[PDB]
Amino acid sequence: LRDNIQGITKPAIRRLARRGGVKRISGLIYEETRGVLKVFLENVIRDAVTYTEHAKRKTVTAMDVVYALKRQGRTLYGFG
Amino acid sequence: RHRKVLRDNIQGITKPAIRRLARRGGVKRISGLIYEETRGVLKVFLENVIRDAVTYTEHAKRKTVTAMDVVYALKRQGRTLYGFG
Amino acid sequence: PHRYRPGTVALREIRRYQKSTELLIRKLPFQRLVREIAQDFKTDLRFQSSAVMALQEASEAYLVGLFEDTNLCAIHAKRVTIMPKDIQLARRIRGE
Amino acid sequence: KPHRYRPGTVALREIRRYQKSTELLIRKLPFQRLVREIAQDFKTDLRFQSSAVMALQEASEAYLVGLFEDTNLCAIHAKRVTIMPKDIQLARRIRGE
Amino acid sequence: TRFEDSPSYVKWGKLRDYQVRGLNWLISLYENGINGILADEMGLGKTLQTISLLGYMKHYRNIPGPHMVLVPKSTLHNWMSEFKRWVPTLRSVCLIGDKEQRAAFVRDVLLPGEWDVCVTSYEMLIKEKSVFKKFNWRYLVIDEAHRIKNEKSKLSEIVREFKTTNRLLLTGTPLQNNLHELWSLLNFLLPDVFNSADDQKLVERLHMVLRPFLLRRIKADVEKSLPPKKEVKIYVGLSKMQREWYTRILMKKMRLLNILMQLRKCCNHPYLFDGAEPGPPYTTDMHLVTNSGKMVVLDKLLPKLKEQGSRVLIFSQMTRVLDILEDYCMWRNYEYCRLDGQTPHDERQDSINAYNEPNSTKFVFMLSTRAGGLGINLATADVVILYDSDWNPQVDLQAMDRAHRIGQTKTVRVFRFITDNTVEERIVERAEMKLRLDSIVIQQ
Amino acid sequence: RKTRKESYAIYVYKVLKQVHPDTGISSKAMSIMNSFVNDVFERIAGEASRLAHYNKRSTITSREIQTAVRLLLPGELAKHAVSEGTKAVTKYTSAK
Amino acid sequence: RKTRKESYAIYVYKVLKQVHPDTGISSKAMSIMNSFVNDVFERIAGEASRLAHYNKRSTITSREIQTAVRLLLPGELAKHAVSEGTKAVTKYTSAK
Amino acid sequence: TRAKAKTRSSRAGLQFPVGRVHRLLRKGNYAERVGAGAPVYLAAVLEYLTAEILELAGNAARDNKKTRIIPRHLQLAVRNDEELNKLLGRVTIAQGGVLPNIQSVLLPK
Amino acid sequence: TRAKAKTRSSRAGLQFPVGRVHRLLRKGNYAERVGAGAPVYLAAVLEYLTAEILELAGNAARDNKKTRIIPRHLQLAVRNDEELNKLLGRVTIAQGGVLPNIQSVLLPK
DNA sequence: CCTGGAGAATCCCGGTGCCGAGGCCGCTCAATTGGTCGTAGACAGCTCTAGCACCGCTTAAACGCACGTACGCGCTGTCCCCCGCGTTTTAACCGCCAAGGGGATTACTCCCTAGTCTCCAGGCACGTGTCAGATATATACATCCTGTGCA
DNA sequence: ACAGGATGTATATATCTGACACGTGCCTGGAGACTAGGGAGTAATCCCCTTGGCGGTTAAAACGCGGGGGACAGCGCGTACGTGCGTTTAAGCGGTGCTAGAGCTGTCTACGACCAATTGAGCGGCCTCGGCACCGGGATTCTCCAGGG
Ligand SMILES: Nc1ncnc2c1ncn2[C@@H]1O[C@H](COP(=O)(O)OP(=O)(O)OP(=O)(O)O)[C@@H](O)[C@H]1O
Secondary structure, eight states: OOSOGGGSOHHHHHHHHHHHTOSEEOTTHHHHHHHHHHHHHHHHHHHHHHHHHHHTOSEEOHHHHHHHHHHHTOOEESOO | OOOOOOOOTTTTSOHHHHHHHHHHHTOSEEOTTHHHHHHHHHHHHHHHHHHHHHHHHHHHTOSEEOHHHHHHHHHHHTOEEESOO | OOOOOTTHHHHHHHHHHHHOOSOOSOHHHHHHHHHHHHHHHSSSOEEOHHHHHHHHHHHHHHHHHHHHHHHHHHHHTTOSEEOHHHHHHHHHHHTO | OOOOOOTTHHHHHHHHHHHHOOSOOSOHHHHHHHHHHHHHHHOSSOEEOHHHHHHHHHHHHHHHHHHHHHHHHHHHHTTOSEEOHHHHHHHHHHHTO | OOOOSOOTTOTTOOOOHHHHHHHHHHHHHHHHTOOOEEOOOSTTOSHHHHHHHHHHHHHSSSOOOOEEEEOOGGGHHHHHHHHHHHOTTSOEEEOOOSHHHHHHHIIIIITTTOOSEEEEOHHHHHHTHHHHHTSOEEEEEESSGGGGOSTTOHHHHHHHHSOEEEEEEEOSOOOSSOHHHHHHHHHHHOTTTOOSOOOTTTTHHHHHHHGGGEEOOOHHHHHOOSOOOEEEEEEEOOOHHHHHHHHHHHOOOOOOOOHHHHHHHHHHOTTSSSSSSOSSOOOOSTTTTTTOHHHHHHHHHHHHHHTTTOOOOOEESOHHHHHHHHHHHHHTTOBOOOOOSSSOHHHHHHHHHHHOOSOOOOBOOOEETTTOOSOOOOTTOOEEEESSOOSOHHHHHHHHHHSOSTTOOSOOEEEEEEESSSSHHHHHHHHHHHHHHHIIIIIO | OOOOOOOSHHHHHHHHHHHOTTOEEOHHHHHHHHHHHHHHHHHHHHHHHHHHHHTTOOEEOHHHHHHHHHHHSOTHHHHHHHHHHHHHHHHHHHHO | OOOOOOOSHHHHHHHHHHHOTTOEEOHHHHHHHHHHHHHHHHHHHHHHHHHHHHTTOSEEOHHHHHHHHHHHSOTHHHHHHHHHHHHHHHHHHHHO | OOOOOOOHHHHHTOSSOHHHHHHHHHHTTSOSEEOSHHHHHHHHHHHHHHHHHHHHHHHHHHHTTOSEEOHHHHHHHHHTSHHHHHHTTTOEETTOOOOOOOOTTTSOO | OOOOOOOHHHHHTOSSOHHHHHHHHHHTTSOSEEOSHHHHHHHHHHHHHHHHHHHHHHHHHHHTTOSEEOHHHHHHHHTTOHHHHHHTTTEEETTOOOOOOOOTTTSOO
16 A cells, blocks of 8 residues: 555545635645644554454454543443 | 822732743833733732632532642643642 | 635535545544554554544544634634644644 | 943743752742641641642742743744733643633 | 049039949949949939949050940930930940941941940841951940840840850840849849859849849839829729620620630720721711710819819820821820831930920820830829839839839829729739849849 | 344434424434433543542442533533432432 | 552662663652553453453453553564563473 | 432432442442432432433434434534533544535535 | 572562562552562663663763763753653753754854 | 626525434343341540731832833735636546354353451651752853944 | 854853751561362364356446636735833732641441342334335526626
8 A cells, every 4th residue: 555645635625624614725835734633543443452452453443542532531332 | 197008919029020921922112011910810810720729629528728729720721730639 | 617715615525525424534544553653652553443443533532622722722713714823732732 | 330240141042040949939938928828718826837838939949930831832832932812822722720 | 432423524414322432333343353234223324324434444554445335226326315414525426317327337437446335236136146246345335235135036046146255235124024034134144153044032132133233222112202193093984885895895707816816905095906996087076075984084183183283184195096186186285295116216216305305285185105215304294194014023114114203303293094804903913913023033 | 133232312312202292203313313312421420430540449339420410511501410419319319 | 657658660760771771760750650550550451351351251361451452552562562471481490 | 117218319209229339339449438419419410410401402303203212313512612612622422524614615616 | 497588680680679660560559469570670661761861861960070960961861862852851850951053053153 | 986787696485305313122131129137437535737817127129210122013025836717637436246253152160359367567657867959159151232444 | 244242051160058868667468278160171063144257237437628717926014022121010929827626536326238039021023014215297596607787
């Protein structure tokens, strides 16, 4: 797998910005958004993989993701 | 008859003190309206911390607020203080 | 031929997307991105579908909040358009 | 004729001086009176240890210094040099208070 | 065992038998190497004895070496005037001022060492401790010895860190609260002797051990002047508003931490409080007099003293009582004099002597209970009025005998107004306990 | 059958029928409510545990729960929750 | 005689002698180091407790401590700390 | 003999399981001992908070011309009340969305 | 007879109190059972963190030329280091001051 | 510079299918009841430390004031960059099927940990002396700022 | 663009002091040695759920183009803030006096843990039906020229 951060298309970043409430978006915003998304995802995925390794599983579970998010301070309601 | 209120204790913290705080922060020019806002912000922060500390002291059944109570309240608020317990 | 002014469609889309509640990123590209990021920490992982859905939900929420703070910064700087420097200021004041 | 420093050099030297120093900047007795007046609201006939007021003062100084740092960042973002109440409010809003 | 007449080196010296014998006693104490306490209350005078002692040490065997006198700032120019009057041979130097004045004075006078006697105050002593320690001291005189009555006090520690060959304590009331402070004074006198803290176990043993190195005479049985005092305690029941204020405070927003302190000055004037005062100062009128029982008592006593001497006294314990009484004095078109820490020192001190006049026709002189110093030649006073009593009977004794100078040849009167069913009764009970302890331990 | 999974779902449904008699809930909303209840339980219990440790005690009691509620809930919610808990303890003591 | 208090001061001073022979510490700095050790202990122990509860086990072990260290520390510290702890347990199991 | 088993929830008049809360407290490792009234207090608090949020959610769902509470209604209820927002300030609700707000500058002249 | 008592810290080559850590784990309400190697692991990790911070603080103190360590040196060591800054990001060190930094825009030119 | 049409966009409104919400049933495991015991904690008594209130003196800090100067804040002009829209391409989405990996469960065994007792040595409170840090004092240096010639 | 002066600041030296490092005595908790029991390791089995392929449909993304609005720089002004000075004030340090209240001991009791028997409350599984989603058609509303006001 390679070059999959580009799958986060410009229309999707525009839709997220529109939900945020922004009207005008500069051209350099998209690379910055891809970077910040990658950093956040990497933190959460590392913590989830640590939980999964402790459980000695090979499958990452919704509970693992929720526990990682709770550790980060970003509690998620709905999946467990 | 010579008796009147002295001052208000939020005015006890002063413009030069706030200027020194801003200098430590890294500020060069300060607007004139900054001081009332800083007094309000400080009042809010102290209100929250003192409320939590008074709750801890009430649970312990004491009438004296201790440094341990203040440290526990600050840890509750997410502002851990090292150097008092 | 009828043509809208630059900003009517943006406001209509703002209302539409702030009314809706669905995910705003493509599920398969997000899933491939998650698998790619997981490739580094451990080889040959498996994922439940709910795990990928939860990750996508959290990512959407984080980006939405960040964009809201960025919009506040841009309005503060007497602008309408958001910029990378706006995002960076938002992150720095958040605590990253 | 008397020597006069231009408007902004004494401020910079004060910045350096107070960033090198370590002691507390608010006055002890005014701060203690403020703490007692605030405690009056929640409970009457309260005593305070000496260490309690000092810990409170340390926390207040740290909080205000960090807030002014973020305020300066906002003011520079707006291409000003002066800080404003709107800068303070933006800092608080982004931090989440 | 010394000269029975006046020394040949003292000018205008009219010291009497008690003074010459005390000088001989101090001389003999120096000869035997024992440091003592001169416990003459007020009348015999101890400044004269100290000056004569130093003059003896100078004009006899050659020890004009460094000597130190510690006096409060209220008596500095008084001591300088006494030194220049009685024995002008000594070159006393007065050490007062801020950092730059202190530096100039020390560098230009103290370091060259042309001086003979250094007179300073306790505060300047603490300020210049380090520069003082270098000089080897031959004779250290501490006036008002009850200042160092408490061990682990900064003045006591500093004065012990000095290297003094001889020591001397001056105090008019050696005992104030208990035997521990007296032991502290004895420890400063001779640290190597009274290392341990400890009517047959007490009183008599202390009297016997104090006799070798303590001397105390009584103005009545020595001077034969100063006619005795008739003391009257007038019991005044507080009026209805005062009683209800007392109850509403005792049973109960406003801060009430120290119940004892807050209940106290309430009998004196219930309007010193903050937030409990009546409306804003619309005018100065009959609000102060009528609303306090002690105020109505003093106000009804005043016309008698006016139709009579009208130069009597005022004594109270609170600066706010002092201020409200000042306002009352101005409202009643009377004139007073003010002595307090807030008023500039050097200029108040000469103002006191200036106001000392054969005739004033001003009917009022107002003093605080502790503001009284060591001078104040109010021989014009006739009665001492105590608004309230303090915990220490010694403070009240100092306040009452401040107006009992010899300038006073007529019998002085002591008037006390006492509030029933209040804390004044206990305060009086403690005070009389302490006074009885002091009397049995010293006078008996 | 499969293993059992505890949930607060039936109690949440009963409370819902108490407040709005003619309304229903979806499975996702019930999952959210179950998570909310677990979160609040965790916060209150952890705060009470820390209180018991600080006071050098070994029992969790109604005083500890009340102090935790005062510390965690803001303002009006704290007032009303303390009132409700006191009422429930009174009823349990009387009807025991 | 005053009651006793348990502090990490002796061990902190030993480590200071080990890492800087001719250097000292002050009382306030020692209090800060004591608070720091207490705080890190609380964080690691709480993470281990929650891990054991998640996996439905009643015993905290070296696996739980290792995972808690990996979760709470940022990167290089985590790697070096894992090496340290593994070395310590190896030496402990070697003959004891 | 023995009386009919009366649940402690019915004894306290609660809709939440007092016995289950007691067991969760005992097996949660919060303290060595658990008092009798602590589960009752905790169940009452949980009931009050649940009733509050469900009342707000029901009103929101009614305003939308629906009779099933969905995460959108829960999110609107939580974010439109300041105390519940402060309680749930760090919490993300799945399929919730955001509150409609547009900053007044962006609105056309 | 009995063998001479060797401390578990000595057995594991540590300068931290393994037995005290074990007692704290058992009385801190973290689980029902505690392993043998868990206190050893935790003591070693605490030792590593303490050694790291003390080394950095001693270097800072030597830079300022003081042979004693003060909270100012502790704060200077904790900042100027990314890993320890992440660890103690939300911790206030009493009388430790602030890092010297002035924004370049304010600098005169 | 305000109206008035066009023209998209949105809302409203009726009808059709579907699938998840709500009810019902059987079963079993967790909560209730009853009885016993042993410890946590409530309560009273006593000690002595630390907090509260006040005064006196010194001096650093705060406060009020005057002057000028950068600095914030409108205004204007340029132009470039982003938005709105039509078109083409690409890949997501959806349904279906097949196959195996790995999560989940159960039974069995044994090894590790808790619980006790004994005793002894590490660690803590207390006391003490000396050295590192604070302070003062007079160089030496560095930095700012304005003024004068001649760039 | 430099000279010189006037601030301020870093450096080197001498004194003094109070806090730190060390020592000593004592005691309470940790180690050494044993027991027993249940929690976790291990193996084996089942089945479900994840991955992987495959084809068709269609929405969504990529691409290009034109134009208008907003960013950004420049300029001017007039005002509010920095700087320095002289006057006032109250903070900080030292003392005093007192007492509440925190902290430790002793004692007993009532409350929670524990165990056994019992039973009904809740959970999984199942069926069914009304609320919701979608759809198309018509009515209302917002936006943008263009034009005669
Ligand atoms: N020149 C003098 N002639 C006679 N008696 C004198 C003289 N000077 C002092 N005294 C005595 O001293 C008494 C009080 O004088 P003064 O006020 O100077 O004393 P003092 O120094 O305040 O005393 P102390 O501090 O020892 O109580 C007089 O009543 C008198 O007995």
